[PDB]
Symmetry: C8
């Protein structure tokens, strides 16, 4: 297909939601190629909105998948390295798909000199940085 | 099974809370598949919260699991590498399951130039 | 071909936007070499912006590419290492092509000493 | 045991305090399984309080243990990798068991443009971010 | 050449702009050695300005080059390691050549205690840090 | 030996202060086991402080130790890996024994967009 | 020696200043053992002051040394790993010996939402965090 | 040669400025050893500054050197590892020789909870 087809768009969203990657999805019988999907996306806001929802679901599916890829890795040096790569790629991607949920988490205890208060001295501007 | 049902949602939760993963929960007869679980969660806020605490409980189980995976690793190159991957994946996941508890911890001592006060100029 | 020409610049863009890299675009008959493309960009602001969105579109294509490179890696030491390099290079590049979208994501919970309020003294 | 048993809870706390991991503890003769311990924990505040103290002690014990795991590692490639994993897992866990004591430590010397003062310009809100 | 030669300076800028490294450029027929280029740079502002432009272009060229070095790496352990080194060296250098464009990119979602507001308590100075 | 006793607590301290680890101190005849040492510390604030300075003194000894471990490493793959683990463990531990002294050190030059002033809007 | 000996203290400072490590220095003919040096340090402020100066010089010497350790490494897998360890250990130590000179260096370009101004909303305290 | 002498100090500088390392400068006949160079620097502020610019010039030479070391690395495991160590050491050193130029570069987009404004409560 080249023409926008909502039925097909819907199927894409469903498959993505389950965790399948776009390139893999576009290899399925009857699917548009990736370039076409991106073009559909550019011109059809209904698809874009559904795609955003599919992306959120996709991330949640991948978050479960990473346990399985690690746990089921074949105990062979190269196969373990590949599992690691598949997992690391997913971890990186998850933070971009849903930054609020899957971004890094840090708690910073902020203290000042010698563990006391943070010491701040304010002055008038000394150069023209306006 | 596709139609949202509490008690089923309550069941899954209790199952996760006891340490069981969502994949295994969904591979049980009568259990909705992963897609259906997520759909539910998305459309039901009460299940979202309850699932969230199951998720926190699950994290506490996984926390103890990583010690076992590390300590009991088979002393062979590929098995140790696999154990490290299993542990690293869990560590990363734990921070997302309970950010306040399992997120990174840093104490930053903030000082100014040469260890003096922090110098600020305001326009 | 050295003289700046829209529609040619529009062409390159559309080509990048569809996922094609600048090297391949420039290795096409009639296409300006890389140096000439950059010269154009530098002296024409309208091409700079248009190229910038081609660049963002290109990033979205590369994002999907990294899954394929990782998942389809040949299970051999050197090939897996090469796949990892291809992926790491793309991940790094993506952040620069669209910083707001593909940059690192951190949530920092900022607290004060012993988890109390952040203590500040001002002069 | 399934029913809450303070005597057993107390023994768990003692063993944990000495650095032993929960899963290992639950393998000892007569111990409840991990799921049960977690259930005891959920319903009994007396156990939760004692468990928090045991967790603090556990971390202090592990902090000493890491030197030994490294120093005593068998000089074999795989055995060294495993020691490293056991150590790295403990380092990560310690920061979560007692963030104030075992979290990362950084001193940030904060300066501004060209090593001068930090330059700040304040303006009225330009959008409705309230 | 030892004496400053604008024609030669111009050629250097052109080659650098295309992504070639200075040391490699200075190995070309008729080129000054690196020390001389640096001396030309120190004394001739016209060259310095053109060199800054060449450095910006150089970075943009290298940014494309890294894909090729990775993608075309010979699938041999040592050759992959070398490609990685060539790539990592370029990534590091790019951020220094154009920090605004090629520096690291981070989005920090800043929150306070327990996910609420950031809690700040101000006090009068308690020591003489003026 | 379980009952808290100064001079014994003073002894342990002096022992740690001289570089000796708590494991070795506790493996000496007449010495309380690790559990008992910690119990003491927890219930006695004076021992807590004194032990804290023994800990800082111990850190200074370990600091010099890491040079020796690195420089004198046996030039064999597994031994070098073990030496690196011994050193990395010590480096990590040093930061916790004396955060102000052995913590990470960063100088952050803070600037605003495009290297201009930091732009803030306040509501 | 056990008794404090300024002549010996001075020699220690000289050797340290040149980059030699304390443990190595204490192996030299006639030197006190490390424990003794630390005890001398604790009780003699004149030695402490000279030792601080020696530590600064030591770091500057080590900063040059790292180039040599890397550049001269025997091209053998294990020997390269050891050189790396010797170098990494020195890099870490340098930042602690002189944090201002040898600490990490970062320039943070701080911007706000969507690349605009940093958006801050202040409110009255909502809990008693005083 | 131990007594501080300008022109000698000027010489060393010019030598460093041209890319030569302090070790080589000091291994030249008539040149003070490293200890003496440092002593000088410590007691003479004018030499400190001049040496500082030699150091910045040296950094610019090393910057170009790392490309050569990486690109011309012998395609053998141990040689590539050695080249990587030589490069990593230089990269680390460059940041200390000229922090403003060769330090790390980060752009932090600072936002508040859920991407809204940064929320602050003041006491």
């Amino acid at each position: 297909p080249s023409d926008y087809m909502p039925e097909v768009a819907d199927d894409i969203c469903s498959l993505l939601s389950s965790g399948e990657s776009l390139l893999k999805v576009c290899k399925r019988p009857g699917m548009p190629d990736k370039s076409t999907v991106f073009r559909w996306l550019a011109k059809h806001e209904d698809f874009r909105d559904e795609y955003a929802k599919a992306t959120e679901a996709r991330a949640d599916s991948i978050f479960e998948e990473i346990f399985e890829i690690a746990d089921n890795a074949i105990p062979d040096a190269a196969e373990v390295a590949k599992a690691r790569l598949r997992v690391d790629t997913r971890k990186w991607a998850l933070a971009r798909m849903n930054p609020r949920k899957y971004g890094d988490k840090v708690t910073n205890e902020l203290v000042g000199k010698d563990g006391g208060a943070i010491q701040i001295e304010t002055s008038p501007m000394s150069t023209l940085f306006g």
